[PDB]
Symmetry: C2
């Protein structure tokens, strides 16, 4: 049973409704399960939608963002708390620490970098937290093929491939991450 999670996404929602709509479903799952949210502090894109839902849903919303990135990811009128930090690094250690599991929701390079990093810490044993993945409309099928390529070729261990918990819907992803211990 989780107390909070740090979803990874960006300032874009994606052209097709499935991505934004997928982000709304994750928010609704977090609300129903009474789980607080940790994220990049962005007030727009999938980040805006995610915290926007959990906030209104009641649960706590803790955003974490680097000083210089604020003019980029925060526009409009902020909702929820933000613990500004030094830079990308502090952000990296701030998103983990202040959170539990990790759903690296569909996103761009920043989000990809965040996912690979959390899995990397679990692989090395730096920390022991569930690393999930919401594979909306197969957006990550490729990334899911690269991990294996790494296994088959010998750069990733067969067991280490099991660090990634993915599903096509927020509902199943949450169940999976709750049905694995």
């Amino acid at each position: 049973r989780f107390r909070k999670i740090c979803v990874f996404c960006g300032s874009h929602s994606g052209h097709r409704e499935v991505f934004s709509d997928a982000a709304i479903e994750l928010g609704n799952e977090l609300v129903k399960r009474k789980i607080d949210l940790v994220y990049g502090g962005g007030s727009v894109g999938l980040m805006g939608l995610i915290s926007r839902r959990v906030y209104e849903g009641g649960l706590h919303v803790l955003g974490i963002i680097p000083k210089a990135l604020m003019p980029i990811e925060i526009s409009g009128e902020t909702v929820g708390d933000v613990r500004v930090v030094a830079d990308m690094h502090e952000r990296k250690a701030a998103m983990a620490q202040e959170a539990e599991a990790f759903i690296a929701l569909p996103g761009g390079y920043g989000t990809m970098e965040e996912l690979l990093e959390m899995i990397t810490w679990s692989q090395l044993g730096i920390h022991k937290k569930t690393v999930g993945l919401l594979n909306v409309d197969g957006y990550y099928n490729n990334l899911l093929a690269l991990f294996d390529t790494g296994v088959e070729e010998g750069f990733i261990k067969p067991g280490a491939r099991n660090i990634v918990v993915s599903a096509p819907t927020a509902k199943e992803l949450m169940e999976k991450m709750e049905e694995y211990t």
Copy 2:
């Protein structure tokens, strides 16, 4: 020959892969670094791919530096060392120190950890954090799935053109070098 780089950081780990083609590639990149008078920078691993491109740039007269978090020394360095092995306390220290010393990067094939530096360095270029070309030897299409993922990001609006333009890859160290030497 001439080059616009003096120091190159190559991402890769302590595993060389099952097929010998990947080890062959690691050495070739070393050769491309040596022929161009480029010093090497890496994680400090003595085995795997790191152990190959490190012992190559060394036997080439160019300096080698294996920056590594102290807790990863016992598990990484073994048998001996090559060049200088800068040692730090954690991950971010290594990430910043390797990136701070590098004028460019190349992600040789590798597992999760390799995909860690590769994505962040590109992410940093995308955010204008630094102005540095990002490379990756795409041995036998090892990353054909990552490039396809990037394309997917572009086609779905999460990745703009210019950003996708950050990645500079090739199937051989020679072409990759030629493509990166000519990047803007």
